[PDB]
Amino acid sequence: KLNHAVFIVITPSAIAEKYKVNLSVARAVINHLADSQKLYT
Template sequence: MYTTICINVPPKERKTKEQIAAAAAASGRSKKKKWGKGKNKEKLNHAVFIDKSLQSKILEVQNMKVITPSTISDKYKVNLSVARAVIKYLAEKNLIKEVCIQSHCQKLYTKVA
């Protein structure tokens, strides 16, 4: 029932020490994996101070429906600290009013009706 199949396999070639050394030298060293740097965001060049031309533009903020530090920072290209200072100034002058008092992180303001 069972059949046996015999296959003659040729003997394995024996390499000499010189051949092994030559093969190792030819292959070279395996290179180290280079880790990717990831995605680099482009550095934003926002203003840190408010000059005269920017001051007149920023006073238009009081006409916006939704006022947050991020919207001012994006629209007028100023730092968030400057945007918060502008909002604080406009709120003290009663030109804008605070809407959301719940959140302590992101303040939300709107124009005075």
């Protein structure tokens, strides 16, 4: 079941492992810091 939340290496997978979040909000936080899947910089 789902218990992760948007509340609180910008890699989606690594940050999701580090913070236990949904993948949509994980890419949200990726956008929050930087500003289907992409090749990495």
